[PDB]
Design an enzyme around this catalytic site. Structure first.
Site: not given
Length: 282
Positions: A104, A170
């Site tokens: 990310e 996530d």
């Protein structure tokens, strides 16, 4: 029975009503508003409770769950880094737990600056990053640790221990065992640092707004709230605080999304069941 499907359905029912009720309206007086065009919220729909906000230009909230005091925030935007470092320093932050994955952070499309793994200069603030231990949390999940030394002309230099879990995806819930191990490591890291300040006679020990662990993932509602929930259950002062209590408290003090996914709630429920802790308030 107290952790059976009926209780779980009732728990979700109560929290779902709270989540919808707390959804932000346009210019919602309950939520911190962007100042003058500068982006405040990383995600338009994941907003910052005004009365518990830490700084007017951050998406970040003081959170108290039972007795456990923390700060939950979003991954700071690039424009927010100076204010974010000022928050970290003024809070005498005893641990910064970052749960955003390395991929990310690496993806420039996501605008998540690599602010704790490299040194940098942000406005008047210069930040030195040093690598320290690495701790395996189970299931191959790894906590990479650092110290951020925050310097600013005329300001007291503050070093912040960092616990970075770089492979917690996530929108997922790592197992209750991994969460328990991560909560222990974050709590342990903060206690070592808090003790240092106490042995120094820091005036931050007497300040309820200071010495708070700071936790963020990308949005500060999902993996972040799972960890905060696990940490509050490690606090011996929180006997009998229910899962309904802790999730309701996170939501009223940050936003209705806290504990975003059912798998994240299920981790909290399993941890509560291990402690004989109630899910529901009578």
């Amino acid at each position: 029975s107290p952790y059976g499907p009926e209780a779980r359905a009732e728990l979700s029912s109560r929290l779902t009503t709270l989540r919808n009720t707390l959804a932000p309206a346009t210019n919602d007086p309950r939520y911190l508003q962007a100042c003058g065009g500068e982006k405040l919220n990383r995600f338009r729909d994941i907003q910052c409770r005004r009365q518990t906000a830490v700084r007017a230009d951050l998406n970040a909230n003081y959170i108290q769950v039972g007795n456990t005091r923390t700060i939950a925030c979003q991954y700071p935007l690039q424009s927010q880094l100076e204010s974010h470092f000022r928050m970290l320093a003024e809070n005498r932050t005893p641990v910064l737990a970052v749960l955003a994955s390395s991929s990310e952070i690496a993806n420039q499309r996501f605008g998540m600056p690599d602010y704790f793994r490299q040194s940098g200069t942000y406005g008047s603030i210069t930040v030195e990053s040093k690598m320290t231990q690495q701790v395996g949390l189970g299931d191959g999940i790894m906590a990479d640790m650092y110290t951020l030394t925050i310097r600013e002309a005329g300001q007291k230099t503050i070093s912040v221990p960092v616990v970075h879990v770089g492979n917690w995806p996530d929108q997922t819930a790592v197992s209750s065992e991994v969460t328990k191990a991560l909560a222990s490591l974050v709590d342990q890291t903060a206690e070592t640092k808090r003790n240092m300040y106490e042995s120094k006679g820091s005036s931050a020990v007497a300040d309820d707004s200071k010495l708070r662990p700071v936790i963020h993932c990308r949005a500060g509602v999902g993996r972040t709230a799972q960890l905060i929930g696990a940490m509050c259950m490690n606090d011996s002062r929180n006997s009998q605080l229910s899962v309904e209590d802790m999730v309701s408290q996170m939501r009223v003090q940050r936003n209705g999304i806290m504990v975003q996914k059912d798998e994240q709630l299920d981790v909290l429920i399993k941890l509560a069941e291990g402690q004989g802790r109630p899910l529901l308030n009578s």
